[PDB]
Design a protein around this ligand. Structure first.
Ligand code: K5M
Ligand code: K5M
Lengths: 6, 162, 155
């Protein structure tokens, strides 16, 4: 859940 | 400790310490990169790590800083980006990741770096695993440690670099 | 952290943050974020916040100068209050109940500048330090999640 893609 | 990072008194010693820390944590290849405020002079960024030299040269020649979704993410966010297939969306990004895998960079994540004086950079770390599920399990287990590491590396690295 | 990042409005977001800080053992918090007239949330005593502005303590508080130079946390320890003005400052903070705690500097991707300050209640500084160190890895993630989501909400 820590994966981010702005 | 995170302490000998701050205590290191030279880029070469510092680099060696940070390399050993990432290795000790279980990561394979790393790239720590830092630029000063409002800079896109990638060719002169403070760079440490063991990313393959052929990949680093290919990346600069192909102008990948403008393709790589990790780089654009780091300009927008302080949160980590895992190298999930789903972030390589355009054809150029898909080809970029294919090339990355030829250089051995298949599983990993990048922590954006945003310094107190506007420094901008990244701490990228690759994982060697049998599959992406295994790689993601490992990275999630060490993420709280990595989250502190990236700010200690940012603070001490920026002091040595600028 | 997800419900923080998913909050709809500032009031909901502030309430979640406050609860998360309480669950980590902190009784008072102040989150402040200036753009590149800031975004302020928390439960710091209102009279302290007013005194702080009126006294111009931003130019005295060692926490503020630390945040402009670093991304690392600073614990509120006697050794950081040096000048005379800085001792008086910490004496007044005590009157407001801000005795033990730490501040995480906030440096946003778009140049936002801020702080996440957290106060803990303890019997002595050694105990306070144990309380804070025991949750510091979680706080270290929280401050970046709060930075990213708060910057998006306020600006
Ligand atoms: C080392 S360099 O030649 O001096 C250089 C020059 C210009 C820009 C640089 O940033 C690259 C850092 C971002 C990153 O890690 N993306 C991952 C995404 C994918 C697996 C593979 C990567 O590479 C580095
Ligand atoms: C809340 S406000 O009135 O709108 C306002 C207005 C202008 C500047 C503000 O930043 C101050 C935040 C830094 C901080 O927490 N230092 C601690 C250090 C020590 C126990 C005592 C503190 O206070 C806050």
């Amino acid at each position: 859940a820590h994966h981010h893609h702005a | 400790g995170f302490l000998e990072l701050e205590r290191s008194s030279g880029k070469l010693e510092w680099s060696a310490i940070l390399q050993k820390m990432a290795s000790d944590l279980g990561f394979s290849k790393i790239l720590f990169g830092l630029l000063p405020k409002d800079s896109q002079d990638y060719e002169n960024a403070f760079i440490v790590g063991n990313y393959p030299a052929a990949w680093r040269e290919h990346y600069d020649r192909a102008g990948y800083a403008r393709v790589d979704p990790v780089v654009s993410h780091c300009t927008q966010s302080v949160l980590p980006i895992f190298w999930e297939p789903s972030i390589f969306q355009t054809r150029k990004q898909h080809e970029f990741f294919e090339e990355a895998s030829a250089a051995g960079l298949v599983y990993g994540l990048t922590m954006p770096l945003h310094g107190a004086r506007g420094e901008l950079g990244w701490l990228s770390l690759s994982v060697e695993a049998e599959n992406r599920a295994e790689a993601n399990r490992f990275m999630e287990s060490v993420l709280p440690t990595l989250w502190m590491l990236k700010d200690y590396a940012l603070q001490s690295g920026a002091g040595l670099a600028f």
